[PDB]
Amino acid sequence: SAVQYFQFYGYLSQQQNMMQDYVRTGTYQRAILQNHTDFKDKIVLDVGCGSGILSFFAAQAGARKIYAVEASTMAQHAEVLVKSNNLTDRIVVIPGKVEEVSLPEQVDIIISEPMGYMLFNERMLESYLHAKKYLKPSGNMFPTIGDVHLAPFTDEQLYMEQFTKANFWYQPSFHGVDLSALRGAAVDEYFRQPVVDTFDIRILMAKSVKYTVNFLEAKEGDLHRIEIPFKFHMLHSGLVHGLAFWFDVAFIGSIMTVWLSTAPTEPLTHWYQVRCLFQSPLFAKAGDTLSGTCLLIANKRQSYDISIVAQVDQTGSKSSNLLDLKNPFFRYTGTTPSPPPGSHYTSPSE
Amino acid sequence: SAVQYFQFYGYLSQQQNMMQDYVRTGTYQRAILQNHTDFKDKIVLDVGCGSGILSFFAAQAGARKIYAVEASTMAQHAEVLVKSNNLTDRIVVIPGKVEEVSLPEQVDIIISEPMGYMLFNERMLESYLHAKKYLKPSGNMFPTIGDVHLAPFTDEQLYMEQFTKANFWYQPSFHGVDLSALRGAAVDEYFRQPVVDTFDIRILMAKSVKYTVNFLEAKEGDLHRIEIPFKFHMLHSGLVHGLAFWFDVAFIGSIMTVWLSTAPTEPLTHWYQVRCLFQSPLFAKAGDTLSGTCLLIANKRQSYDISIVAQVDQTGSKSSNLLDLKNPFFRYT
Amino acid sequence: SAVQYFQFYGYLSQQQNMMQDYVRTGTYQRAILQNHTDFKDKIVLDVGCGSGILSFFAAQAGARKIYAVEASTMAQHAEVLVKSNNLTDRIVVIPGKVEEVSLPEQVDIIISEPMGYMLFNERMLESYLHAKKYLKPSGNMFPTIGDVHLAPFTDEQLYMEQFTKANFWYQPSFHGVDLSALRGAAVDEYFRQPVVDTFDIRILMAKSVKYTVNFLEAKEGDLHRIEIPFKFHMLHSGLVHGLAFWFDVAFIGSIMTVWLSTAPTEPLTHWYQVRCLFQSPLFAKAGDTLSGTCLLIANKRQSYDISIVAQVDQTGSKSSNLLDLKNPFFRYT
Amino acid sequence: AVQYFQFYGYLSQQQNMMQDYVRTGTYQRAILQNHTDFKDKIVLDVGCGSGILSFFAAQAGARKIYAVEASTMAQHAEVLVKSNNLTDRIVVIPGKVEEVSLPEQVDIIISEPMGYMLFNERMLESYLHAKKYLKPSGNMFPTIGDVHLAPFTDEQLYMEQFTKANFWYQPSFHGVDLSALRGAAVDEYFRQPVVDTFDIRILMAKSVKYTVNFLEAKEGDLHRIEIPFKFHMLHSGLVHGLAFWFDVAFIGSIMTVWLSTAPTEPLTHWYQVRCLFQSPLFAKAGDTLSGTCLLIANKRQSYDISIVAQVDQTGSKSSNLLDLKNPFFRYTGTTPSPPPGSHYTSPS
Ligand SMILES: Nc1ncnc2c1ncn2[C@@H]1O[C@H](C[N@H+](CC[NH3+])CC[C@H]([NH3+])C(=O)O)[C@@H](O)[C@H]1O
Ligand SMILES: Nc1ncnc2c1ncn2[C@@H]1O[C@H](C[N@H+](CC[NH3+])CC[C@H]([NH3+])C(=O)O)[C@@H](O)[C@H]1O
Ligand SMILES: Nc1ncnc2c1ncn2[C@@H]1O[C@H](C[N@H+](CC[NH3+])CC[C@H]([NH3+])C(=O)O)[C@@H](O)[C@H]1O
Ligand SMILES: Nc1ncnc2c1ncn2[C@@H]1O[C@H](C[N@H+](CC[NH3+])CC[C@H]([NH3+])C(=O)O)[C@@H](O)[C@H]1O
Known part of the structure; x- marks a missing residue:
């Protein structure tokens, strides 16, 4: 069910669990900041913004306007963070499904984190691709x-x-x-x-x-x-x-x-x-x-x-x-995975 | 969702998790067998039979007829076990919600396992009580x-x-x-x-x-x-x-x-x-x-x-x- | 506040607490005695002498005259120790703040223990530095x-x-x-x-x-x-x-x-x-x-x-x- | 006087006093169990600190409570009065009880002026001084x-x-x-x-x-x-x-x-x-x-x-x-030992 999917991502703990993945979050931040010319004074769409973290990274990279679309109740929390970080004039949280909401203008770049197990699980990539209807012909996708x-x-x-x-x-x-x-x-x-x-x-x-x-x-x-x-x-x-x-x-x-x-x-x-x-x-x-x-x-x-x-x-x-x-x-x-038996080609006792 | 609830209990692994709780299963069996006279030649209703285990305990205690109601797909598995245990004449699986199915007769005793965390979680107790519409006036409930x-x-x-x-x-x-x-x-x-x-x-x-x-x-x-x-x-x-x-x-x-x-x-x-x-x-x-x-x-x-x-x-x-x-x-x- | 500081260091128990820090006191004594040539027949200033211990160390190292400045009442206790240790011709207790007293001559070396928490706490270091107005050119400071x-x-x-x-x-x-x-x-x-x-x-x-x-x-x-x-x-x-x-x-x-x-x-x-x-x-x-x-x-x-x-x-x-x-x-x- | 009030400006000391259950609980009991001495009365809290006793007085039904405090704690109390929705009943007065002015005379004075051996810190004098604001036949807590x-x-x-x-x-x-x-x-x-x-x-x-x-x-x-x-x-x-x-x-x-x-x-x-x-x-x-x-x-x-x-x-x-x-x-913190020779019968 879709309802359940969005209920799952309504909890701050889940958002937190994702945010605490340093590889994921850190790599997104680096990807965005190190490519600042793709963001400076540009229009951005964040598909499924959750807490809003990627939009904040886009703002750090100098984006002029970031539309942050979110379908779960988390959207209300993202709005609180946009205000408390004084970014109301640059980030606009839009509650709802990216398939159903309306965007005021077309965007220069779409950012998202739509990956699941073995990439495809949860079927968020479809929404991510769906959002391309708002992308300018010269637009980019992060991830590409x-x-x-x-x-x-x-x-x-x-x-x-x-x-x-x-x-x-x-x-x-x-x-x-x-x-x-x-x-x-x-x-x-x-x-x-x-x-x-x-x-x-x-x-x-x-x-x-x-x-x-x-x-x-x-x-x-x-x-x-x-x-x-x-x-x-x-x-x-x-x-x-x-x-x-x-x-x-x-x-x-x-x-x-x-x-x-x-x-x-x-x-x-x-x-x-x-x-x-x-x-x-x-x-x-x-x-x-x-x-x-x-x-x-x-x-x-x-x-x-x-x-x-x-x-x-x-x-x-x-x-x-x-x-x-x-x-x-x-x-x-959490236990260290063992290599297959018969991996020793030289005497282990030496 | 009720859909979600019954999907959860459709899995054999979950039935296995419950069945392997020896205190639970053993205590149910002892409760039923030590009170065999409450079952001997009686009509029984098993509310949410799952794998059918409680119904089998009721059959062991001599019950004449056991209606085993189950809304999840587990119902199909229970039917297989009734057949393989040669109890087709005594245990009758009724697929569906106890709120919606029809039973042929009123029963002498209702058995179920409707407890969740803090007793009330999952709200199976409501269904268990609803099943009382099938209970004869002097009938019993296990748990009481x-x-x-x-x-x-x-x-x-x-x-x-x-x-x-x-x-x-x-x-x-x-x-x-x-x-x-x-x-x-x-x-x-x-x-x-x-x-x-x-x-x-x-x-x-x-x-x-x-x-x-x-x-x-x-x-x-x-x-x-x-x-x-x-x-x-x-x-x-x-x-x-x-x-x-x-x-x-x-x-x-x-x-x-x-x-x-x-x-x-x-x-x-x-x-x-x-x-x-x-x-x-x-x-x-x-x-x-x-x-x-x-x-x-x-x-x-x-x-x-x-x-x-x-x-x-x-x-x-x-x-x-x-x-x-x-x-x-x-x-x- | 300055009053409180100098009241705090007026108690013999506090002086005792510091003197019983053997690493501190022992390291100072070793520093002074192993470098006796920096003191032999020299003029010394002890900034905040307290009990006078460092001045006694300077005297042990052969200093000719030691001006021991102390603003708390401890100054009188130090003077008692100078007398009872028969060092009146070499250690001279000067009561008062180092910023305000008058010394008759310039000195060859300044000794002090001005350190507090994180080095800087208590702000005695600035007084220690202020005291350089009495230091001869090319004079030394312990600590350096x-x-x-x-x-x-x-x-x-x-x-x-x-x-x-x-x-x-x-x-x-x-x-x-x-x-x-x-x-x-x-x-x-x-x-x-x-x-x-x-x-x-x-x-x-x-x-x-x-x-x-x-x-x-x-x-x-x-x-x-x-x-x-x-x-x-x-x-x-x-x-x-x-x-x-x-x-x-x-x-x-x-x-x-x-x-x-x-x-x-x-x-x-x-x-x-x-x-x-x-x-x-x-x-x-x-x-x-x-x-x-x-x-x-x-x-x-x-x-x-x-x-x-x-x-x-x-x-x-x-x-x-x-x-x-x-x-x-x-x-x- | 400066250092004294600097000491009580810290929330940690107020907390240390509040966490003394005997003191705090006994004050609360004394005030609440004697509700007729507070219900619809005018109260003065001498040195309110965090304001706790004033809140106890408010729980007891006081019509108006003047809470005098000389340390910076006065503002923290002000924040608590606002956040506990009692601004029309509790008035925080920053300053020394000897120097501030109260508009009314009061029915009862509350305070916690005791120090080591009772007298240490000499707050009882301020406490007694506060009687200039007490109505005749008015009460003192503690009495x-x-x-x-x-x-x-x-x-x-x-x-x-x-x-x-x-x-x-x-x-x-x-x-x-x-x-x-x-x-x-x-x-x-x-x-x-x-x-x-x-x-x-x-x-x-x-x-x-x-x-x-x-x-x-x-x-x-x-x-x-x-x-x-x-x-x-x-x-x-x-x-x-x-x-x-x-x-x-x-x-x-x-x-x-x-x-x-x-x-x-x-x-x-x-x-x-x-x-x-x-x-x-x-x-x-x-x-x-x-x-x-x-x-x-x-x-x-x-x-x-x-x-x-x-x-x-x-x-x-x-x-x-x-x-x-x-x-x-x-x-x-060690259990105090009794004097040696306290055994009148065989310990074995
Ligand atoms: N079609 C859609 N329209 C709007 N919102 C959607 C959506 N599909 C998923 N979402 C949300 O998008 C977030 C997904 N992701 C990853 C979950 N594996 C959150 C990532 C977040 N941007 C971050 O990087 O912390 C969750 O909050 C989901 O409710
Ligand atoms: N209103 C209802 N109508 C029909 N079936 C129902 C039901 N409510 C729950 N069930 C099933 O009842 C079983 C519950 N229980 C325990 C779950 N905590 C299994 C009991 C089984 N008799 C056993 O003890 O192994 C599960 O299979 C559930 O789908
Ligand atoms: N401007 C100042 N003028 C005069 N006296 C001062 C002073 N600043 C500190 N003192 C005293 O110097 C002593 C400090 N020290 C360190 C205490 N943390 C005493 C150490 C003593 N010399 C020893 O080594 O035993 C204390 O008695 C202080 O009153
Ligand atoms: N003349 C005076 N005028 C106003 N305030 C005074 C004061 N003398 C002491 N105080 C304060 O009284 C409080 C002391 N007491 C007890 C400490 N031994 C706190 C009592 C407080 N009402 C409580 O019970 O938590 C501290 O905040 C002190 O600044």
Whole structure:
């Protein structure tokens, strides 16, 4: 539901949680300030301003007028901050959906933070693209482009954990009740959940594949159906338990390009990384090719139905999987991720 | 939304989380089996059967026919278990809301698990009471009664934990931005959050006060406005940081009465306990009396508007508070 | 106020308290005796001799004549010690303020112990500098130079101790009275308090910054306005709760240079260390630079109005703070 | 006078006084339980500080409350009067009660003018001075003040003074002979009244009480306070000095309420005060310890204390001169130990 989505972002604690992500917030601030010529005396649109922080960064960069659109009740709080920071003549908070509000004029640049898990979750990118109707023909988008990265991984424990949980139902006398008939359904449910957390990069079995969305060119409708083909050339031999997902966005300004990355090679963000499991894992040897497709289909719950089909070309062994991005499993514990066993090529005792 | 509510309970993982609470499940089973004569050859209604477990307990106790009503998709799973457990002739799953379905006959006993945090959360108690339209005049209800217990507590660490998070909004220059104008709003939000977890009973400053709901006598409408008065006789001197809440239910059967407790003196359940924090603690001395009321008003979001007003009678120190069950702080780890 | 100062130093217990600081007294004695050649057959001025201890040290080092100026009543006690130690021909107690007395001749070397908290507190340094009107050209001063050290620190416990105290004025119903309107005033007051005590150096977030006062060159008026710029290169990521202050002085003699340090890495002195708290801490990452200035303005109440302005340059996060040396928080155990 | 009022300008001290539950709670109870003395009456709060007592008076139904305050605290009180929506009932008057002007005479005066040994800080004089604004038959809250004194024995406290002074009794402190100042150091320590608490078992006789009736007394009475005493010794031993504490009474129309700082009561921010004899006196149980404690007002907002004590049966005499404005704060928080030899039955 949309109501619930906007209720979630009405809480100051959630805004705070996002603001406290230093990578995110700091990178946005740097991206805006270091490209000051894209903002000085310009007209700006902030799509989904929340607390208003990005608009304040735009004001720090010298913007003449900033329209800050916000659909949740947070809009009232942003208005309080615009007043208390004495920026009433430069920032105008507009309550409502960017799809339904009216803007007084066209803008030189649109800024937003529309990314969700594996980039697309929450389907805010559509609104962000929708807002382009207010952009002048020479206008810019901050972020300008988004890269989704995919890679196959091996993680036997993560895989087996699912069955360990579902096997609760495989008992003939739970307080006298035979639960076993539901074991299959429980297994399916667990494997339909994308897994949100981080991992050691050594579990990755091949160089990532990149899928790019150019926000200046893309159309809203483009995000209702996203087909991501992939061809992985395996670097390590073993069992492929699924695909890991992360993303980067780039702010391409007149002075410099600034990147915000959620890669597992980078410090963690509140986006972590996402893994989609194969219910049937695939064996591959170094040198093999793992080919297939990831298809994201927009649904009515502000999310996507994910279909992943993969095959090892040399053996023809196939795996097909369906996942629901709206019900991810938050697994992150804070514990340092262990590398796969058999990572020692020299004696650990030396 | 009701949609949201029933979507939450459609997941098998959630059913599993509830089922693996051994105190809960075991206490229900014992309550039913030790009172088998209340079930033997009887007609039963299971309000919100979920996986169907309570209906299976009713069947174990010899019930002749069990109508198991369930509004979520879980209903389909319960049907599978009834079939696989060879009980098609005794357990009948009725998919839908208990407020909207039709039952073939009146029942001798209603069984359910309608309790949430502080007993009243999620507002399933209303549905449970509504189901009484299907109850024969001499019929029973399992649970028969529910007691919510309140007690004042002292916990500096918790108070400062919430305060520290709220003070983020005190910053005059977060990346150059002055957030302070929202500090009052932030404190209000954080302290409206019920704190769900457990605690050592040594933090309790007075004997608990009890508020009883008799499910046999109560009417549905009664749960639209719940006024809970309290008068505590302080046993320890110190700072009262808020009120702790937990609950007991009793299954009053023909053979014996069995209690299910979520008290902090008892083994932990998936309900843990709930605490309401005061934005400013109240100082009290041993022997003082802490008086006031907890008022719950049903709202349009499947929940309650809750106000807690407490005062130290001797000094007139008053605290007024709002609690939002829609936004709990799950602190347990 | 000057009256109060000189009343304070009139008590023998205070003199005792200072004399029993063995690092201080011992370091002074070593500084003077190891550089006996700077005193042998010389004329000395002891600014604020108190008990006279430093003058006795000068006499031990072979000085021909020592003028020991003291404005408090302690002057009479010193004279008793000069007589009982049979040093009347060498130590001459001059009662009065160094700014007002008359000395018969110019001196070869000035000795004093004019340091207070953060070096500058109590404002005896300007009197010490004023005394140079009696110094022969190329004459020496013990101490010769003073280094004030600054460093950012993180200490959540201290911050919340002070914030907890300030939150008393947050109460909306203290014995029925709403105090909250004064919370802003209370927070401002408590956080204006320098925190006097020691700490583990592990709380420091960056290499200290040095500010040097050369007592041979500095002029009296210079201590009426002191501007200390600083640029810290952050070595650790975290919350900067404020700035830590300490000081060293050097006695640069002809035989050797002797240092008296009050650094937290050194044995404790009665000066401890001083910390200034920010009402709101500043977040910083390793590699960032924390820049700003500490401005001390002499006020008419024998103290300084202190302003500390600091910012995290990468984010523009600013903190402006006031410190009141007149109202310290003595925290050491 | 400047420093005195500078001290009370800080919110932290007001807070320290407010957090003393005995004091604050007892004032609140005294005022609220005697509501007929306040309901629709004209009130004067002498030295209102934060204004707390005025708020108590307002809770009790006062028609108008004049709150006089000489320190900067006056504005903080003004902020609280506005924020508590009581501007038509409470009027904050910045300035000294001796110098400001009130338009009306009042029915009752409230204040908290007590210091160490009751009299320290000399605020009672201001309090009594304020009676120029009191209607005839008007009341005083507190109405009377009782100072209690009793002889004590505390060998450790006594010997402590010499232990501290003997720092100066050494011939080569870093090469310096300090000995000549030892006598001066000893006299200095013994001039300091000792502020802290103690076990009531160190007290050697029932206290003697000196009462000041604030309804009857004049300001001038407090310039010279002569407190005669005659103790009937209950325990035998060495008498090292006199212990001091005080009570005040709020004598209302409905009931009388007491605020005590006695060592038998929970501790207050006033603690208790002990004045040492530089020469102790031996006494037997049953002997009489007679003499006088004379408090003489000085210009330092305090008193010079002269204590002359004698054991009548032996004629052993001791005299002491003390400065109440420079007391030694000795309190540490440690549970006070009773004197050794307090066991009458086997401890094992
Ligand atoms: N079509 C739309 N019209 C208006 N407002 C919208 C919106 N879609 C999302 N929002 C808000 O936009 C914010 C989203 N974001 C990120 C959430 N992952 C807030 C980012 C904020 N600008 C910041 O950087 O702190 C939230 O407050 C959302 O209610
Ligand atoms: N008015 C209503 N009509 C029908 N069904 C309802 C309902 N209100 C709740 N439910 C279901 O009842 C179950 C609740 N409970 C506990 C949730 N805290 C499960 C009870 C089950 N019998 C068990 O004990 O495992 C869930 O499946 C809910 O969808
Ligand atoms: N302008 C001045 N003219 C004369 N006397 C002064 C003075 N300023 C301070 N004093 C005294 O100097 C002493 C200071 N010092 C340091 C005290 N923090 C005494 C130290 C003494 N010399 C020692 O080392 O034992 C005190 O007695 C002060 O009254
Ligand atoms: N002649 C005088 N005229 C006006 N004000 C005076 C005063 N003498 C003392 N005060 C104030 O009285 C207060 C003292 N008292 C007690 C301190 N020992 C505070 C009482 C206050 N009403 C409370 O109970 O909190 C302080 O603010 C003092 O500046």
